[PDB]
Enzyme design. Sequence first.
Site, PDB file in Angstrom:
ATOM      1  N   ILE A   1       0.831  -1.204   0.000  1.00 11.01           N
ATOM      2  CA  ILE A   1       0.000   0.000   0.000  1.00 11.01           C
ATOM      3  C   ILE A   1       0.865   1.253   0.000  1.00 11.01           C
ATOM      4  CG2 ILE A   1      -1.474   1.388   1.489  1.00 11.01           C
ATOM      5  CD1 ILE A   1      -2.957  -1.229   2.168  1.00 11.01           C
TER       6      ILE A   1
ATOM      7  N   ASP B   1       4.174   1.208  -0.598  1.00 14.63           N
ATOM      8  CA  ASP B   1       5.361   0.973  -1.413  1.00 14.63           C
ATOM      9  C   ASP B   1       5.373   1.971  -2.565  1.00 14.63           C
ATOM     10  OD1 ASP B   1       7.539   0.048  -2.794  1.00 14.63           O
ATOM     11  OD2 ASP B   1       6.653  -1.883  -3.340  1.00 14.63           O
TER      12      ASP B   1
ATOM     13  N   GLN C   1       4.198  -2.238 -17.399  1.00 14.38           N
ATOM     14  CA  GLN C   1       3.509  -3.475 -17.719  1.00 14.38           C
ATOM     15  C   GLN C   1       2.034  -3.160 -17.908  1.00 14.38           C
ATOM     16  OE1 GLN C   1       5.182  -5.656 -13.915  1.00 14.38           O
ATOM     17  NE2 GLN C   1       5.457  -7.036 -15.664  1.00 14.38           N
TER      18      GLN C   1
ATOM     19  N   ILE D   1      -4.766  -5.893 -20.754  1.00 11.25           N
ATOM     20  CA  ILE D   1      -6.134  -5.551 -21.111  1.00 11.25           C
ATOM     21  C   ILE D   1      -6.955  -6.824 -20.991  1.00 11.25           C
ATOM     22  CG2 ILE D   1      -7.674  -4.638 -22.875  1.00 11.25           C
ATOM     23  CD1 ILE D   1      -5.812  -2.573 -21.699  1.00 11.25           C
TER      24      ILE D   1
ATOM     25  N   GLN E   1     -10.499  -6.431 -25.354  1.00 10.27           N
ATOM     26  CA  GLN E   1      -9.487  -6.268 -26.383  1.00 10.27           C
ATOM     27  C   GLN E   1     -10.145  -5.936 -27.717  1.00 10.27           C
TER      28      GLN E   1
ATOM     29  N   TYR F   1       4.530  -0.924 -29.996  1.00 13.19           N
ATOM     30  CA  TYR F   1       5.314  -0.089 -29.093  1.00 13.19           C
ATOM     31  C   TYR F   1       6.281   0.803 -29.851  1.00 13.19           C
ATOM     32  CZ  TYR F   1       3.512  -2.722 -25.157  1.00 13.19           C
ATOM     33  OH  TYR F   1       2.673  -3.257 -24.209  1.00 13.19           O
TER      34      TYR F   1
END
Lengths: 167, 167, 167, 167, 167, 167, 167, 167, 167, 167, 167, 167
Positions: free
Chosen positions: I47, I49, I82, I85, I90, I130
């Site tokens: 929580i 972190d 990271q 979906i 999708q 990407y």
Amino acid sequence: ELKLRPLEREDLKFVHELNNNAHIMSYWFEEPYEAFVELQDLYDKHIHDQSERRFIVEKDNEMVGLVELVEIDYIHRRTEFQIIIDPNYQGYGYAVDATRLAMDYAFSVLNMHKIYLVVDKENEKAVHVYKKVGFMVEGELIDEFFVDGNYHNAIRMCMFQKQYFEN
Amino acid sequence: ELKLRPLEREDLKFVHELNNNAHIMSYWFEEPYEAFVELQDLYDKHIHDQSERRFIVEKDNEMVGLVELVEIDYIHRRTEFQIIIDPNYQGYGYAVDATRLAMDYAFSVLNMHKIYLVVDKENEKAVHVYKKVGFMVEGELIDEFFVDGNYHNAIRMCMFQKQYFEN
Amino acid sequence: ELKLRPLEREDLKFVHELNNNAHIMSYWFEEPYEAFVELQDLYDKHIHDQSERRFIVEKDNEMVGLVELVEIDYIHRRTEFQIIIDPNYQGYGYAVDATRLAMDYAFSVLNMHKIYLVVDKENEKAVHVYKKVGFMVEGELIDEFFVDGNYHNAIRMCMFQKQYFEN
Amino acid sequence: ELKLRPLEREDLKFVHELNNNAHIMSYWFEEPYEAFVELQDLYDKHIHDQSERRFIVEKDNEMVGLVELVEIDYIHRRTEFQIIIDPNYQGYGYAVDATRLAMDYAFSVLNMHKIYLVVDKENEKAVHVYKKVGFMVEGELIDEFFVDGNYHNAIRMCMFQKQYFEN
Amino acid sequence: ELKLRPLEREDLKFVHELNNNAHIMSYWFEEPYEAFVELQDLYDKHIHDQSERRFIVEKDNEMVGLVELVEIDYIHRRTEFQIIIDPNYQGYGYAVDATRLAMDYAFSVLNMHKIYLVVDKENEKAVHVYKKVGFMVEGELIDEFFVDGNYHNAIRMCMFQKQYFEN
Amino acid sequence: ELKLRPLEREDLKFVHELNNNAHIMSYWFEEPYEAFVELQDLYDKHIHDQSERRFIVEKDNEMVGLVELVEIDYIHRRTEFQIIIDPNYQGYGYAVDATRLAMDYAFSVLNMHKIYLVVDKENEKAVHVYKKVGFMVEGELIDEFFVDGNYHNAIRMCMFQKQYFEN
Amino acid sequence: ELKLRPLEREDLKFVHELNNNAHIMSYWFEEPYEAFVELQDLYDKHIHDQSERRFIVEKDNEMVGLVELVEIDYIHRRTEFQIIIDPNYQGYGYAVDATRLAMDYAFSVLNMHKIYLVVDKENEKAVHVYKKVGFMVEGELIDEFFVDGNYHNAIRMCMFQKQYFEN
Amino acid sequence: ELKLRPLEREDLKFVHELNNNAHIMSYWFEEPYEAFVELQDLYDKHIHDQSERRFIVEKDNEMVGLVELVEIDYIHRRTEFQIIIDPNYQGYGYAVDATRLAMDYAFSVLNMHKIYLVVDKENEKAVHVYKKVGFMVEGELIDEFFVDGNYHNAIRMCMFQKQYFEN
Amino acid sequence: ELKLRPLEREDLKFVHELNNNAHIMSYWFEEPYEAFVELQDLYDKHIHDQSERRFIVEKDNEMVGLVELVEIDYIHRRTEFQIIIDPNYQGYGYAVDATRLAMDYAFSVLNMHKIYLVVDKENEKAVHVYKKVGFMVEGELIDEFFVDGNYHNAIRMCMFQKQYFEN
Amino acid sequence: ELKLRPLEREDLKFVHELNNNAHIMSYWFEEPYEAFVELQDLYDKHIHDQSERRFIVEKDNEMVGLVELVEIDYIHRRTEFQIIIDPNYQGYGYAVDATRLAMDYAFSVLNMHKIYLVVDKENEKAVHVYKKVGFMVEGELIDEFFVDGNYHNAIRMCMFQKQYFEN
Amino acid sequence: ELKLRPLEREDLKFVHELNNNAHIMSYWFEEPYEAFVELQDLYDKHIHDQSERRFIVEKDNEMVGLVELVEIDYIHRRTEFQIIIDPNYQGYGYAVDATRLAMDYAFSVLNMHKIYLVVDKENEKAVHVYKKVGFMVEGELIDEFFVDGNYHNAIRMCMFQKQYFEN
Amino acid sequence: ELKLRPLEREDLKFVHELNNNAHIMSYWFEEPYEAFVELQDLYDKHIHDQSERRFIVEKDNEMVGLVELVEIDYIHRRTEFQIIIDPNYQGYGYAVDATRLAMDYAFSVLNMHKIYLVVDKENEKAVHVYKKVGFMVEGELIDEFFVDGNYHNAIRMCMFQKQYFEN
């Protein structure tokens, strides 16, 4: 001059011996068994217990006794007085002086209305001494304590703040 | 039939009403203040305290009283008996029956040598009831409790296992 | 009939509304900020604090005020008295009756020698009410509290157990 | 040069000797009982208590006294000043110098608006000395403290930041 | 009438929605990420943090904003003021009223000497409004905050207690 | 004179060697394995266990044995007696004297109604000696303990408080 | 069909009713007092205690009894068997069926060498029943248990794994 | 060669002396009070606090100063630089060399975009020295710190990563 | 409009379904096993972190994905991106929109210098996508992850802050 | 007198050197890495683990080996036997003597039905020695342990209580 | 389609019913006793135990079995496979499908070199089934498990990653 | 002979000196700051962390370096190798021998499929050394680490278990 000081942790060894002397633990009606670590842990548990005032009776930087103002009730203004004088320091009148110091502490410092003590009914000398210092025989407890194989009666004696301040 | 059962946590609300009733908390010499969470937390603290036996006095599945065998000493074999009867259930003889069940519990179950109680010296009815049930006047405690603005003396009464076995 | 009962956890919401009223929290010299969980946690912190007696002033099973006997000193036998009456219940004489109940509780139950309160010098009505019940002006604290941008002096008033029992 | 330094844990023995001297613990109105482990535990508990400033009064690398700025209110900007000089180091003017250092600390460092102290009414010399240092007699507390068997009144004296900075 | 009340735990969801709006969390220079349990736990950790005063700005029992008096220094007597008005409640002047209430709270209740705030230099409207309410432009912090990909300078503005009481 | 004292933590080293002696830990029906830290941790866990009384049998300030009054039932008022004498201190009659000291402690101090012990049926010498001290063969436990590869029966012997006080 | 299942926490109320029946808790030699929260806490404490196997005796999805394999020694391979049948389910032979199931569990599942039980010496009928199931009278314990005001002797009976598997 | 190393726990005594020097604790605007155990406890609390980097400035195996990169913001990439040189080590240029070491650490190691420091406005010499090392006067904070009885303004100076890498 | 919001505890069930889908947990190289209480406990553990930013990708108040900025290094200013979906969502371009939102968050809010992601070598389509969004193929990790019985190579791609702000 | 004694905490250093010897930790199939504090912490964690019996093999007050009876199942009555002899004490037959002592301990003290050990198949000499001591080859574990870069099979050998007592 | 999912806490009741069925708990060699709270606590203790993978075998959203990959050694790359199919869902080939899924999980996800299982020798059908799915009979454990009153031998079977991947 | 041993707590001082050397802690891409208590606390936190294997590189009973196999993934069977050689012990080939020892440990003991390391791109000598030892350049990370004021690219090199066993 004989004085009362707080029972410190470093003093507990002294208390330890008193707590394992059957003869000593007969005046108080306590079982004469306490491991040193048990006594230490209980002392730590009652460090901030305000119902208690544990005193080393000290004479010339020497631990001659243990005086306890226990069961301090702050609404009823009463406390139980208990005293042990180490047998090696008996015969110097330390008992009476320590009793008077504890009486002054409970009546003058703690603002107690009543002090009471409990002695064995067989210990008539202690009753007479406490009457000489000002304690009045308040009552008798029948078969109150199991000591050395028999049920002993006790004399509960009491003193009050007004009678102490007048005397 | 009148019975004693363990004081359960779910019952504490009842005890709460008794613990904040000034008239009820005068028979016992207790300050009539206890927040419900305070009573709950103290009850939790003493769940496994074997020095205590807290009883709901129950009649027809209704909480009519509270009986406590406290300060249970397992070496000296004595315990203090305390009793409260709900004011709405007074006059039914519940006090005497609950006292008899508590006496039977301490003498027959807990194997106690002595039962003692503390009543007000003015409380002549309770003293007579306890004498009828078997208690003997053991002593008088002078100015023992500060109640309703004045120092009250108390009558400490006691009964023993042999006298209970005689009946 | 107006009564005092222990301030219970379930009542805290009421206290919450009182503790965030700036006008109410000016009578007491308290900052008018307290999150509900903060008040709850402080109440939990002082559940077993014997220096405190927190009372709901109740009239006809309804919470009309809050009376606190705080800073209860059991050696010097004095306590600070504080009182709040909900503005919805002012004009019913609840302040005087709750003050008299708290005085009786501190003097007769808690065995207190002294009660003291601290009010604003501007609050002549509260000073008059406390003088009506028996409080004497004990002293003046100069610039004691910072209230609404200014340093206010306070009147410390006191009453004693003997004078209370005489009247 | 006489200085104030933080009361360190290693210094507590010194404090211990002061806290069990009945005469010393009478000027402050404190019960003269504190086991060393009790004082240690309270000191550890109040390590991060910002309401307190505990000072060793040191002269030539020697602990000659104890000065405490307690009850530091950061909204009302006031703190209670207390001072003890070891009886073996009295008569050197250490009390007045330590008082002036503590006043400078509260007014110049802590940004306090008000300093107040409480002395015994019998101690007219202390009232005179504090008036010479700049303290004004603020009020009298009736039967405020039970000391050595009697209820003593107290003189509360105060000083303010503007009057301190002007002189 | 618009009021400030303590930010309660039950209100945190509202704060949550404000704390994850990037546009809102740009006025304050805060990352617009906070899980609800993270906000809840941080609120719980700071329940007794006296460095903070978190306020729900409420109008007609509706949460219209959040006002924070944070970094409350009790020695230097200064606090940082921050304000968010819900975009659904913008255009009603709620910002100015909440700012005036927070100023009154910090100067009159918390006895602060100084209030300071930090806004974006691009937000000339906020700077102009704060000058209208009494805030003085104190300084400019160069590249102080990374907002939406660029280093933004900030305007730090301040107000003082004397000038506030004069106005 | 041979005496019993509490088993102290500092004594545990002694106990350690006794607890890992297979021959000794065969008289008691114990597995002869105990790491020193394991024994230490169990001793610490049972410091306040009132069901136990662990005694060092001491002669001339030397640890010659271990006497345990375990399983102390305070309702049925019975306890199991166990004794070990160090092998280098065998042949001195220490076993019988320590047994009489433990009997006196359980009957006269702990107010036990019954003492019972368990020896191996092969150990006829112990049965003969305990009959000489007053124990009566109470019963035989068939295949009660697995010792050195075989199921051994045990002789349980008992003594009572009335017969002990008569003798 | 009668079965044994683990004693679940959700079943404890049933056990509670059994644990406060003085007549029921007389066959087992247990004090008939247990608050529900006390029983719950003890159950939680012994969740992972492998020395015990607590079974609800269930017939047609109904809790008809409680069977306990306690004091399970895994080196000596013995366990104490105890059984209670709810009085409303007595007379159905549930006791014998639950006893045989418990013996099958201890001998076949737990791989116990010995099972032992303890009944009252007055309960000769139970001794005969246990002889019918295969138990042999192993011994008699003199004045072993204080029950309803008197010291009662007990009959300890035992059975072994080889004799059980042969039958 | 002068170096920066981590502030170790064993070094805290040194820091202790600096934290109790009022003159030293005037450059930083910190109250010159910190008990040694208080400093130790805060250091332990911030062992894993990544928002700070505490450095001993060491010259020839001797602790000559303390450099702190505090309030390290890892999103806005700024940190406050603070420095103390022990009065016994002044006049060796240790301040400027340690300042340059801290600048290199924040810009080259911590990848900070901005360093800022706060000095007293009266300390124009420090402002000029920091301008010589590359710091630019960023702003003035009015009445920002209460020092020795007066509200002092501060000069906040800043340096950025690009100009530092150019120089 | 598609948005990123903090991953809340109440959302974990959604994440749960994603974390136990072997096909989904192949894109990330995670073992497709996580008990719901395990995921909840890890979420509670992280929580506060700050190394991670977990986002629910939300479209029309529906949880359509999970975006994680993990391994956030605040000195090297890089974080691993990271994205998942949900397969039911999708084909709506949610992956690219969420990727651009996460890039804007890391570069513009978190002030990251570098974003890097790791995809499977088989996913040439993701590498192409990407590269369309601006990521450059940075390197190849040989046999980096054991996926469905075989060691798969991975393509690590990276994007930088300057190129992102320019485009 | 080769003997087994409990593995004490003070002995762990010895074990440490054995636990980091790759050759020694090849006989057991353990990774040859253990920090001393790691071994200490695991030892403390398993102090009260009854599934384990850790023995120092001692000859003439010298630690010559380590014998472990691990995975002690008290229902199935089997335990894994493991032994290490220090290479400096090899060739004295200590392995066989310690193995026989451990067999006697598991069968006669722990009353184990079965002992099993696991050695490397390459160690045919050890398999032959254990067969001479009475162990029978029970089975082969194929590729059971990864040892020095290769998968090694193991020979599991077993002995039973009846055959041990017969011989 | 039959699938494996993580064993969730909410599923434990199902597991509970399997864990107290002696017939079911015979295939695994587990004692058929587990209170529901015991199973819950053990499940919570092993939530983050990576040596374990607990699977609910689910068919059409219904819990038909339990598959465990336990004792997962990550250096030796082996895990024990255990499977239970509820008798109401046996006979549908669920056992073989769940076994195939568990083999695929251990070899393809967990990257295990070896899978091993242990079945009773009486169950030759299970040995044949596991040989059909690819398991090899690895060895025989003599008198390995005490089941229903007799010592049963077990067949340990194993399969390897290469032999699994070849098909 | 050069050896690897576990990094012990008593060795941490050595590690401390390495962890605050800026030049050394740049080859690893670590911030060169760690208080000794911080390093100790992290070491204690990771005592039972199986993701790491920390080694002291020891030559002639002397700590000459530190080798770490960190981020040990037991599913993907890869670990990051890091090495530091004390500058006083460089030039003895300790780096290459320690690297080969760590490779043998990860491949032969930990059964890792892959080892990877990350060095600075400027360090062409280290890349050449690792290629000579068997490492292959796996990839280049652009602007991966901020070192001494500049973004440095890194060369990630890897080796596999089969290629290591072949050589």
